[PDB]
Write a protein that holds these residues in place. Structure first.
Motif, mmCIF file in Angstrom:
data_model
loop_
_atom_site.group_PDB
_atom_site.id
_atom_site.type_symbol
_atom_site.label_atom_id
_atom_site.label_comp_id
_atom_site.label_asym_id
_atom_site.label_seq_id
_atom_site.Cartn_x
_atom_site.Cartn_y
_atom_site.Cartn_z
ATOM 1 N N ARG A 136 1.634 136.414 -143.062
ATOM 2 C CA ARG A 136 2.237 137.100 -141.906
ATOM 3 C C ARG A 136 3.135 136.219 -141.068
ATOM 4 O O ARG A 136 4.075 136.735 -140.491
ATOM 5 C CB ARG A 136 1.194 137.766 -140.997
ATOM 6 C CG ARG A 136 0.602 139.024 -141.636
ATOM 7 C CD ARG A 136 -0.422 139.807 -140.796
ATOM 8 N NE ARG A 136 -0.542 141.179 -141.326
ATOM 9 C CZ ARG A 136 -1.614 141.960 -141.224
ATOM 10 N NH1 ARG A 136 -2.703 141.557 -140.574
ATOM 11 N NH2 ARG A 136 -1.587 143.175 -141.773
ATOM 12 N N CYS A 137 2.864 134.913 -141.004
ATOM 13 C CA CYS A 137 3.643 133.996 -140.165
ATOM 14 C C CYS A 137 3.880 132.680 -140.893
ATOM 15 O O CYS A 137 3.308 131.659 -140.559
ATOM 16 C CB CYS A 137 2.966 133.809 -138.815
ATOM 17 S SG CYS A 137 3.309 135.208 -137.734
ATOM 18 N N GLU A 183 5.949 130.352 -140.733
ATOM 19 C CA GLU A 183 6.242 129.192 -139.873
ATOM 20 C C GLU A 183 4.993 128.500 -139.313
ATOM 21 O O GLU A 183 5.081 127.386 -138.796
ATOM 22 C CB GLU A 183 7.225 129.574 -138.730
ATOM 23 C CG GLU A 183 6.684 130.475 -137.618
ATOM 24 C CD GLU A 183 6.784 131.997 -137.894
ATOM 25 O OE1 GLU A 183 6.765 132.458 -139.076
ATOM 26 O OE2 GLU A 183 6.839 132.772 -136.904
HETATM 27 ZN ZN LIG Z 1 7.194 135.464 -138.286
#
Ligand SMILES: [Zn+2]
Ligand SMILES: [Zn+2]
Ligand SMILES: [Zn+2]
Length: 178
Positions: free
Chosen positions: A53-54, A56
């Motif tokens: 989902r993320c 980074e």
């Molecule tokens: Zn993101």
């Protein structure tokens, strides 16, 4: 699915993950395996989802920043996983339950700590920041090093701490350094 517990490597009453092949004893999984939930996803799956989902979130972080994070649900889960990863090493047996200290030439630590205490502390939401959890985890190994002095048994603390520290760097994406 696997026929043994992913944490303790034994057979018995296992709960199977629906989104990967891992299996768990009820109380080997952290948190304990949930009553219902069909499908059920294990903590490895839930951690992978956070990363997907993320993306980074896998960029490097400063440890000092990670320690100040509030124990919101995603940091709560990450700490649960990091605790589980320590339990996955069989040498965690030495640090699981409440120790005691009676050795000629040594004094017990002021503040004893052990993995099941940390487990309970996580479960009862006693940590408000990641720092709280990490300090108790490090305290376990520190107390061991201090108590067993020059006995070669000190190496157990070093070994298990190394497992902890590696998994902490991985899970919290701490910036790699020389
Ligand atoms: Zn993101
Ligand atoms: Zn198990
Ligand atoms: Zn899974």
């Amino acid at each position: 699915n696997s026929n043994i517990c992913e944490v303790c490597n034994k057979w018995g009453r296992l709960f199977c993950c629906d989104t990967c092949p891992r299996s768990f004893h009820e109380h080997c999984h952290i948190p304990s395996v949930e009553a219902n939930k069909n499908p059920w996803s294990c903590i490895f799956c839930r951690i992978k989802t956070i990363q997907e989902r993320c993306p980074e979130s896998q960029s490097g972080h400063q440890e000092s920043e990670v320690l100040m994070r509030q124990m919101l649900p995603e940091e709560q889960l990450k700490c649960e996983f990091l605790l589980l990863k320590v339990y996955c090493d069989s040498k965690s047996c030495f640090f699981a339950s409440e120790p005691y200290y009676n050795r000629e030439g040594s004094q017990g630590p002021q503040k004893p700590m052990w993995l099941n205490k940390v487990k309970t502390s996580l479960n009862e939401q006693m940590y408000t920041r990641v720092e709280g959890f990490v300090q108790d985890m490090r305290l376990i190994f520190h107390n061991h090093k201090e108590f067993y002095r020059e006995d070669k048994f000190t190496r157990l603390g070093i070994q298990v701490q190394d497992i902890f520290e590696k998994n902490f760097r991985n899970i919290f994406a701490i910036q790699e350094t020389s």
